[PDB]
Design an enzyme around this catalytic site. Structure first.
Site, PDB file in Angstrom:
ATOM      1  N   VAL A 238      -2.271  31.607   4.016  1.00  9.44           N
ATOM      2  CA  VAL A 238      -2.537  32.972   3.540  1.00  9.44           C
ATOM      3  C   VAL A 238      -3.658  33.682   4.297  1.00  9.44           C
ATOM      4  CG1 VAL A 238      -3.653  31.802   1.616  1.00  9.44           C
ATOM      5  CG2 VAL A 238      -3.517  34.301   1.596  1.00  9.44           C
TER       6      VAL A 238
ATOM      7  N   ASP B 156     -16.850  35.198  -3.187  1.00 12.40           N
ATOM      8  CA  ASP B 156     -18.017  34.685  -2.376  1.00 12.40           C
ATOM      9  C   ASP B 156     -19.384  35.348  -2.561  1.00 12.40           C
ATOM     10  OD1 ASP B 156     -17.599  36.934  -0.780  1.00 12.40           O
ATOM     11  OD2 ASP B 156     -16.634  35.817   0.852  1.00 12.40           O
TER      12      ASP B 156
HETATM   13  C1  LIG Z   1     -11.196  36.932   1.383  1.00 13.36           C
HETATM   14  N1  LIG Z   1     -11.874  35.668   1.076  1.00 13.36           N
HETATM   15  C2  LIG Z   1     -13.185  35.585   1.735  1.00 13.36           C
HETATM   16  C3  LIG Z   1     -11.372  34.627   0.251  1.00 13.36           C
HETATM   17  C4  LIG Z   1     -10.233  34.716  -0.562  1.00 13.36           C
HETATM   18  C5  LIG Z   1      -9.824  33.619  -1.324  1.00 13.36           C
HETATM   19  C6  LIG Z   1      -8.646  33.759  -2.228  1.00 13.36           C
HETATM   20  C7  LIG Z   1      -8.819  33.464  -3.577  1.00 13.36           C
HETATM   21  C8  LIG Z   1      -7.788  33.605  -4.486  1.00 13.36           C
HETATM   22  N2  LIG Z   1      -6.562  34.076  -4.027  1.00 13.36           N
HETATM   23  C9  LIG Z   1      -6.391  34.382  -2.688  1.00 13.36           C
HETATM   24  C10 LIG Z   1      -7.430  34.233  -1.780  1.00 13.36           C
HETATM   25  C11 LIG Z   1     -10.610  32.471  -1.281  1.00 13.36           C
HETATM   26  C12 LIG Z   1     -10.310  31.210  -1.986  1.00 13.36           C
HETATM   27  C13 LIG Z   1      -9.102  30.612  -1.669  1.00 13.36           C
HETATM   28  C14 LIG Z   1      -8.720  29.427  -2.226  1.00 13.36           C
HETATM   29  C15 LIG Z   1      -9.552  28.823  -3.124  1.00 13.36           C
HETATM   30  C16 LIG Z   1     -10.757  29.379  -3.436  1.00 13.36           C
HETATM   31  C17 LIG Z   1     -11.557  28.714  -4.347  1.00 13.36           C
HETATM   32  C18 LIG Z   1     -12.781  29.274  -4.676  1.00 13.36           C
HETATM   33  C19 LIG Z   1     -13.189  30.464  -4.117  1.00 13.36           C
HETATM   34  C20 LIG Z   1     -12.388  31.125  -3.195  1.00 13.36           C
HETATM   35  C21 LIG Z   1     -11.159  30.591  -2.863  1.00 13.36           C
HETATM   36  N3  LIG Z   1     -11.692  32.429  -0.435  1.00 13.36           N
HETATM   37  N4  LIG Z   1     -12.061  33.448   0.265  1.00 13.36           N
END
Ligand SMILES: CN(C)c1cc(-c2ccncc2)c(-c2cccc3ccccc23)nn1
Ligand SMILES: Fc1ccc(-c2n[nH]cc2-c2ccncc2)cc1
Ligand SMILES: Fc1ccc(-c2n[nH]cc2-c2ccncc2)cc1
EC number: 2.7.11.24
Length: 339
Positions: free
Chosen positions: A26, A164
């Protein structure tokens, strides 16, 4: 211990529990890579993030610990939290990878807006949610520091979650002027400045302060809110910064009613309270939730605060294996939410 399976998606190796099926890439960043997946245990679509080189150095190791500790502490509807955290390692000695899991969110605010004016109801609801999350984050004495549209996850039902936080389209566009000036004692209202910038953009369809660099960013800001007045000038220690500031051609604060004419006058009033040059006079998240603009959404009995959050580890100077062991401890102690 669950049964793990291995595969290669892009250049990255993913080793996850079999409960997580149908992984598909993704997104990618400097901190880690993300896959969408189906969690067979709950029937939920989830996002799985594999941290990148989490223990390559003391710096990375401390960051990994910081991120996991923060995420384990965030338990609020408008802040990204953890459904699971795991490692394929069966002991500390082979511990090298960390995976984080959360509810899959469909898009970010940047993608959602792309790139027109939202209705006033949508602005009310999206900003209300950012502020509700921010009240919670701030109550734990955490400053987000990097609030911007790409750090706001949003679903097709307009549900919003802050991503974040406390882990510290150009970022500088949403940054507070005192940060452009490198003030080392900035406070939680730097986040309120960012919210003001986001809100203005949702109302107008245009970036409020699209600075090309830090000096240009500060210039654009002062154009709108005016150069500093006497009370704020008294708070600037640096002789060089004062000389610089006092040597700019002085500018008065613009009339926000005219700059944002056509917007709900209540939205205009709130923007005026958020985009105040002197951070000591900016509205707080808690105060903002009580602003008449959010009359349809505000419920003082459902805008909760966070449990105390201990950041004392930030001042510690530990060895790489010590940060790694603390992180391992946090992986093993994780308790998933009710679900
Ligand atoms: C755009 N950014 C910086 C993201 C976007 C996601 C995200 C979260 C939920 N759905 C889609 C994308 C995550 C992310 C992605 C997957 C797991 C995560 C667990 C904790 C915190 C962030 C997570 N981490 N960073
Ligand atoms: F955006 C900014 C950021 C920092 C400064 C600044 N702080 N101290 C001295 C200066 C400065 C910067 C450029 N020219 C003269 C003085 C001025 C503007
Ligand atoms: F030009 C500016 C723009 C912003 C600030 C500012 N707003 N809140 C706090 C400050 C500030 C900046 C530098 N040092 C102390 C306080 C001060 C001068």
């Amino acid at each position: 211990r669950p049964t793990f399976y291995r595969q290669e998606l892009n250049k990255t190796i993913w080793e996850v529990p079999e409960r997580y099926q149908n992984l598909s890439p993704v997104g990618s960043g400097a901190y880690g890579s993300v896959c969408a997946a189906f969690d067979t245990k709950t029937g939920l679509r989830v996002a799985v993030k594999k941290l990148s080189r989490p223990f390559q150095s003391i710096i990375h190791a401390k960051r990994t610990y910081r991120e996991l500790r923060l995420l384990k502490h965030m338990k609020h509807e408008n802040v990204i939290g953890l459904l699971d955290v795991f490692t394929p390692a069966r002991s500390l000695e082979e511990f090298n990878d960390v995976y984080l899991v959360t509810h899959l969110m469909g898009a970010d605010l940047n993608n959602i807006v792309k790139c027109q004016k939202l209705t006033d109801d949508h602005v009310q609801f999206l900003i209300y949610q950012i502020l509700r999350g921010l009240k919670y984050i701030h109550s734990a004495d955490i400053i987000h520091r990097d609030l911007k549209p790409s750090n706001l996850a949003v679903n097709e039902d307009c549900e919003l979650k802050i991503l974040d936080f406390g882990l510290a389209v150009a970022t500088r566009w949403y940054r507070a002027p005192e940060i452009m000036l490198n003030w080392m004692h900035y406070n939680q209202t730097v986040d309120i400045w960012s919210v003001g910038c986001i809100m203005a953009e949702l109302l107008t369809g245009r970036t409020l302060f699209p600075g090309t660099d830090h000096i240009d960013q500060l210039k654009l800001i002062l154009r709108l809110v005016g150069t500093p007045g006497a009370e704020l000038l008294k708070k600037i220690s640096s002789e060089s910064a004062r000389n610089y500031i006092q040597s700019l051609t002085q500018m008065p604060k613009m009339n926000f009613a005219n700059v944002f004419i056509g917007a709900n006058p209540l939205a205009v009033d709130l923007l005026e309270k958020m985009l105040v040059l002197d951070s000591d006079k900016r509205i707080t998240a808690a105060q903002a939730l009580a602003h008449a603009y959010f009359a349809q959404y505000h419920d003082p009995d459902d805008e909760p605060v966070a449990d105390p959050y201990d950041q004392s580890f930030e001042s510690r100077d530990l060895l790489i294996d010590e940060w790694k062991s603390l992180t391992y401890d946090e992986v093993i102690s994780f308790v998933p939410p009710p679900l």
